[PDB]
Amino acid sequence: SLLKNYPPSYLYPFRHPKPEGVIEKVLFNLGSLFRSAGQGMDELGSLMLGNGGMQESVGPNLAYAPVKYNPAAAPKAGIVAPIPASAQRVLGVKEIVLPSKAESTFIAPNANVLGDVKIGAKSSIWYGAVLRGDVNSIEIGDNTNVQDNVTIHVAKHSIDGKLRNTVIGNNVTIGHCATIHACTIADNVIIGMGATVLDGVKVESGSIVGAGSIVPPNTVIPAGQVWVGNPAKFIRNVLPEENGFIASSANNYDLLGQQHKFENSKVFEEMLVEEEIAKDRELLEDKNLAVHQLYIFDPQTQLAARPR
Amino acid sequence: DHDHYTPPKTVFEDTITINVLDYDGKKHAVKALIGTPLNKALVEYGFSSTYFFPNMGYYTQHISDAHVFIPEEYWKYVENVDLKTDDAEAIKLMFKLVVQDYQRETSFFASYLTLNKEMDNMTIGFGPIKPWHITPKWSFNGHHNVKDRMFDRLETGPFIE
Amino acid sequence: MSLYLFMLFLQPLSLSFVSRSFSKISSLMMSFATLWSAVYMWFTSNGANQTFYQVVSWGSDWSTFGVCYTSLYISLLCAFIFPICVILVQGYRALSILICIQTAVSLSIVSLHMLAFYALFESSLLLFFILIGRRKYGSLSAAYNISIYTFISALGFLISAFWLNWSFGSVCALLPNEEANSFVAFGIFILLWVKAPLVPFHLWLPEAHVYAPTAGSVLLAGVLLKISIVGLHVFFLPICASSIVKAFPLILSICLGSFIFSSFSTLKQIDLKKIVAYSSISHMAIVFLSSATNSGLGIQGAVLYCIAHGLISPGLFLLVGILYKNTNTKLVFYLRGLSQQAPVWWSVWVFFMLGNLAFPLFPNFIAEVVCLSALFKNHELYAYAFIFFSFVGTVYSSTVLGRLKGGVSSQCVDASRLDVISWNPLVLATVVTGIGYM
Amino acid sequence: SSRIAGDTTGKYTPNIFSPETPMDRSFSHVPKNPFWEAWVFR
Amino acid sequence: TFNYVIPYGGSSSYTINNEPVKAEEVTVDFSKEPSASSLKLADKSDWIAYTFNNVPLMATVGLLAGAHEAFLHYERTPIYGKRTYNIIKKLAPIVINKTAYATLLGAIFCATDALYENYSGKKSYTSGMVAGAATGAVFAIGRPLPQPLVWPLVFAAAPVIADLFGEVYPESMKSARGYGTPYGFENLDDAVPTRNPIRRNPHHY
Amino acid sequence: ASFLKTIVWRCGFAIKETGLALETLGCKLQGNYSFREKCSRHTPLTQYQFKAPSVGESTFVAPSALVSGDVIIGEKSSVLYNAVVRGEFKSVTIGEGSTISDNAYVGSSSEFSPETVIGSNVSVGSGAVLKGCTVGNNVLIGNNVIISEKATVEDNTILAPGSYVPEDVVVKSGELWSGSPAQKLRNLDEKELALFNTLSVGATELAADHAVIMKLLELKQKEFIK
Amino acid sequence: DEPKHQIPGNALDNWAFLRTYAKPLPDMIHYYYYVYLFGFFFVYKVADFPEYSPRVLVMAALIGSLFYVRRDWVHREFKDSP
Amino acid sequence: VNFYDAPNGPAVEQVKIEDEWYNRQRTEFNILNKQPSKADDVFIAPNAVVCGDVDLYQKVSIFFGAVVRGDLNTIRIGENSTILDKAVVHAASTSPTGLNAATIIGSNVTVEPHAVLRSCRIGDNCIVGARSVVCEGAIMHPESVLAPGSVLAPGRQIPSGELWAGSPAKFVRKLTYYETSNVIRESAEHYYDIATGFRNETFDHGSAWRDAEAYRQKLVDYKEYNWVNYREQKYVMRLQRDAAELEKLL
């Protein structure tokens, strides 16, 4: 950048460096006193507030969260990991199953992905989606989009041997608020928003399941057909162009997932710095300011780039 | 009693397309719903904010108008206005301050035209407009070179800036 | 007095701190508590103190408040009728507007300073402009009418108050001042001419009543028209008697013309609220003329007849509002068979319409007798003129009743339990005043 | 085709999704005539 | 009074009078008396002289109105285009006709006023109303139906307003002072001034 | 009375607000701006004023779940992930052994909603919307079932996924109901009638496992904080 | 459908009347410049005017108000013709 | 991965979801050049997520679990419109009908829990029932109600003053005058009161930041905390990217 004399408070807004001047040191000590008094007043107020005291704490990260490992039933989709020794002498669990995801995969912080979940590259798990692999494995293929508030569930195979794992193929779109229990979905399928897919349902490639449609258990939706309804029934065959739509939706949501992953993955200090970037961008919109005569500022980071 | 219910038409049946000539000279196919005023349909399509001016009436400045050229065959669907009222006053200020010499016999304002089935594939053009000012925020310098949309303007209308 | 003023200030204050879901209940309790404070003010008002029952000042001439015969009656009337307005109105916005309007109006009645009277009374200028011009059921034209009429008349009154404050040095009623100037007398008079609807400055009242809500109409008819007589007894007659006696033939001309033409205009109405609103205009003229005689009979009769009107016209407006809720129509021609379809509503409607026609067992009878006696004290012909043209009121009232009474109707439109609770106090007060407890 | 909206017990709920038309205050509204409306406007 | 038993207000005895007492010991006046020119113009004895003295006001007003309209026309004519017609030949009739018709209306007004006052012999409202009525009648000679009524009424109403607020109003409130004791009430104990307040000097602009 | 409790709440809230403001001012003086962090301020058991969720010892409430207002949850019950149980306006009761599954909403937050009551061994499916309804013992609700206000589900009943129950509609015992207008399909056979308690106990076992894992997560967070 | 006010005149004729306001618009500085100059000189001359009776002053004001032409009126009706 | 033309610049440090030890989800956040706008009285629940070009008008309430994603196209929610729990509002890039694909919600509109709206026009004073799906290009005219568990197919219309129900949503009955005038608005006002309540007990910076501050303070005390000039690093990264893009041959 052009200048190197920028104030340290300007360069490090998240945390100012250690006070060096006498006045700064006195301000630091006064801030310490204020912090302690404020916490005391907070606790006194919390006493009157009653049970709970309106206390707040950081929440656990459930996007990458474990499940109890079963020695009888080995993991199928996810990886198994040891736990810290102190937690071993407290909890007594030897190993815990953890989800397995590729680097390109985007999982929202809100989303809860649990245990036996394998997610492929370029796939996206969006906000509010709950993926529980506690009893049986969940497999999601590449470029597959589990949208907002989608619930994917599994069950145990049981005596019959009926497969109760959930296998989702590549280029599959699961619409918002859809509920998928232990079913199998082939490649290039759109599941409509609100659609319920129950046990034993095999949806063949190229098919579309309509919005708000409940497909009955043990029903095979054949390839290239559109099925809608509360007792989901066939209405029409997929048009040739609608297939290109299916692929286009998958790819568009891949790009969308890349963007959302980029935004969410920034650290706090960078987020606060970017907030200040936006703010002084707004303040610098006036081009008759004295400083604008002095310098031309870089657009992405409003730092002096060259003199005017 | 109890006559037959008439099921509504889907959006596809009651969409008419109008070919709009913009200021640059390009022709745009603007899909529009029957029953909507021309100004709203033009705004929703994504035309720039310079293409439109507020309705210069005492209580109509929230509405966004455009200077448009209407073929003679569709002059019938334009709305009549009473000269002894203030709607004619809004119209007269809009000619006096915006259109001025660029007026033609086909000159009309979009709000006073309502789209219907018989106006399908109608060809209209944006009429040239002179620089105008109401407030520094709501003004037209004379340059049609901003690439925004009048849709993206949440501001309802001109008041003290 | 102090308790009444404190409660009047407390009602708007409470709305700021209420939960916004308890607003209706708190407002109703506050209205009843203000009514009780007004009863306390009546209790602490000794008749031995003949000039003013009570006077309180809070540090300035503007903060001088006091109750007299007229002020006490009008304040009790407004405090009586406010709770009915409170229950009829729903929403924090509407409650806030109506509470602020009532606080300003009730502070105006007890004020003893012309400038403070003007300041409190006109504070409710935008509130009616917003109220009558509400989104769906309001009309901007009526709000413009009422606002402009009030502004011009009150500004003339303000100019006269400024001249009095410059010349005498004071504009408080308690300081005896007399003026013979006709410009100042007209400046004070024009407000009364407009506020008490008197031809040709009566056009604002109809449009306002029709397009105001039922609570708004109830307040407007009940006490805002009566503010004219508080101004006349408190701020015009003490100082401007020479001008009223100089202009008495003109005053009679305008009053009797208002009576006659308002009666004739009532005959051309198809809307129930407009019929009641025009009946109010014809009723105001007798009050204005009886007070203008400046006699013991006239003042008492005018205040009595104001109380009678403030018990009868709110009831008619309330009944019409109930019928409009049940039917979504106010046109007399749409409404038929109401006797068979709504026997309970019809009974009260007929009772109140008889009250408006001044039948003996109603307060309007006693009040009219006193006012006509005052007019007869001035001259026989004065009373004869008013007595004869009272027959015009009978024609339109009878035509309306006959149109509503019978016919074919397929809708049961009768009042619910809430509606009957709403008018029971008015019926009881009407009976009690009618038997002579005026 | 109709149902009782009001509940004296206090357990009143407005069935905006109900197939049957509620017997609310609008049930008794007068039907109205086109020419009478234009006469009122005139 | 503020009671329902006896009449409001009061009465003053006509037999008893109160000796006038000066508002202050020494009176200093910053209001100048009417000039001789004002008395000359106000003189209506000779109706021709009265008319000729007061018409320059009407001619001036007509000239400004005609100049306004003529400039509105001139502003529009294009300088860049050479015009076949002569602009002043177009514009002079505007100003001349406006000035002439204004002067004629003012002449009727002043002449009728002076003639009525001379014939009546008294200064009254009626002279102004009749002069205004005649002027408004001349205004609406060939005009459509409401205007034969409205213009005589408006032109008659104007001198009534002028008389009411230009002559009656000042004379009605000469005595009121605002300082010391109220004009009616000197018995009351208020601070009595040696001299009246001078809020401004006599003007000279 | 209620007014006294409101005054106490307002006073305590004012004190707590002022204390937090003073702590923020101290942080500003020190130059630390960590208070500006926009992180998930979600609390699994939120209280509205003095109404707080009463919760049993053996209960499992997921961290992503929201149990809000005065909600009484009996022992051996589980509110699973991203499940919203709202009892602010009107209270919500959940019986012993009952399960609220993922992305399920149970609430009584409409103006005229009755108090929601859920019985023992009642499993609510993933995605079901329950508003102001009474559910009896041993009831299986489908994944995406909507049950409207004032509707009653009697004991030992199964509602098939996707069924919508209109208000004031009583679902009778020993029956299977389905359809957007819910109508009885068949009487429950004996095996399904016995299946209810087994489903409930399996859900309880799963909840215990999840609680162990959640404790593990809390210890890992504690290591960072302290 | 609702009862509505009848609008006198044809739609196209009324629109043609309204379109006669769309004419080349001069800038207002030209009027303002002359008004400022002649107004300054006018205020200087007024102090020398003879004192007029209030009645004559009011009649002159009435005549001036009646004779005043709104700037829009000339705008609509202006013709560049003899 | 890294968007180098992003409005605020490239990301100097990106952290993986595995490395997160606490939930960092933001209730309002910026997706590249699209910025959500909110009024003062707009309530967004802590669970709720609002991203992209979403414009929230006055008295808008976003309750727990609701996701309003304005990534593909613009979302506008009108005055006193409430999005209830777990209800998803999303916008498509294009609509099948050919009209604007923005998701415009009118005033006094109540979207009941778990209802999905995508690129639809919802008129003023409308109710969308629970688990009701309104697809792309479907337009609900004002004062209309969609019953719970109903689907409006793409490009379909619900007329004003009508109640519609069914998976292929069909006409059921005409809404009464009392319903349209009062109850639909009253539901939105009730949920505004509930959201106003939730706002009144919310602190500006709730005391959950203290836990992360404890970790940061521990790092400071042990001298692992590093001070990074993110602005300068963003500038340098963009410079290097431009130089490399100039150097490349293919």
Ligand SMILES: CCCCCCCCCCCCCCCCCC(=O)OC[C@H](COP(=O)([O-])OCC(O)COP(=O)([O-])OC[C@@H](COC(=O)CCCCCCCCCCCCCCCCC)OC(=O)CCCCCCCCCCCCCCCCC)OC(=O)CCCCCCCCCCCCCCCCC
């Ligand atoms: C070459 C240069 C060209 C100019 C030549 C002159 C150059 C100036 C020289 C000296 C200038 C100083 C003196 C000139 C007057 C001062 C005005 C001024 O300079 O302001 C700047 C002004 C421009 O300012 P602007 O802000 O750009 O324009 C504002 C308007 O909106 C403009 O927009 P608009 O035109 O579109 O709108 C006009 C509007 C603007 O409104 C006004 O014009 C206000 C004027 C009201 C009276 C003004 C106060 C009068 C007091 C006079 C005091 C002296 C007498 C004292 C006693 C009188 C007691 C009242 O009025 C109207 O709508 C039309 C009606 C006009 C009068 C309205 C009153 C009607 C009453 C009659 C009732 C009868 C009807 C009954 C039947 C009805 C049926 C229902 O320049 C001029 O207009 C000067 C033109 C000179 C022509 C005046 C002719 C007569 C002058 C003396 C008579 C006084 C009466 C006033 C008539 C109207 C004057 C505007």
Ligand SMILES: CCCCCCCCCCCCCCCCCC(=O)O[C@@H](COC(=O)CCCCCCCCCCCCCCC)COP(=O)(O)OCC[N+](C)(C)C
């Ligand atoms: C939905 C309603 C259903 C319920 C219906 C209720 C039925 C009401 C019954 C009608 C009552 C009729 C009584 C009329 C007499 C009025 C009562 C009265 O005024 O009490 C008098 C006491 O006088 C009486 O008690 C009268 C005796 C009544 C019984 C006499 C015979 C009954 C025949 C009725 C004829 C009455 C004609 C009077 C016309 C005015 C009060 O005495 P004072 O202390 O002097 O009060 C002061 C006077 N002033 C009120 C004017 C302030």
Ligand SMILES: CCCCCCCCCCCCCCCCCCCC(=O)O[C@H](COC(=O)CCCCCCCCCCCCCC)COP(=O)(O)OCCN
């Ligand atoms: C030395 C001076 C010599 C005398 C000179 C006189 C010059 C004229 C003085 C007139 C002053 C009176 C001011 C009132 C003007 C009438 C109201 C304006 C008419 C009007 O169109 O208003 C509309 C509605 O008003 C309404 O609906 C109100 C209806 C009419 C109101 C009634 C007037 C009040 C009572 C009149 C007398 C009262 C006692 C007098 C002592 C709203 O217009 P907009 O907002 O849409 O704007 C759009 C612009 N076209």
Ligand SMILES: CCCCCCCCCCCCCCCCCCCC(=O)O[C@H](COC(=O)CCCCCCCCCCCCCC)COP(=O)(O)OCCN
């Ligand atoms: C045409 C019929 C009259 C219409 C009025 C109907 C009844 C109203 C009576 C109200 C009662 C008290 C009002 C006092 C007098 C008002 C008008 C009385 C009639 C009148 O105009 O008499 C005039 C005297 O009053 C005056 O000189 C002043 C007149 C009022 C001025 C108008 C506007 C004043 C506004 C001032 C605002 C406040 C200013 C305060 C400083 C001229 O009669 P005359 O005695 O000269 O006999 C000459 C006959 N040959």
Ligand SMILES: CCCCCCCCCCCCCCCCCCCC(=O)O[C@H](COC(=O)CCCCCCCCCCCCCC)COP(=O)(O)OCCN
């Ligand atoms: C604002 C006042 C403007 C007047 C409004 C009236 C209605 C306008 C219609 C236009 C008609 C022209 C104006 C005529 C009004 C004067 C009243 C006529 C009475 C009359 O003729 O007696 C004269 C004195 O009254 C007088 O000339 C002085 C009386 C003052 C007029 C009344 C003042 C109060 C009216 C206010 C009404 C409400 C205001 C709303 C406009 C003669 O007397 P004389 O001395 O010549 O004896 C005769 C010896 N030759």
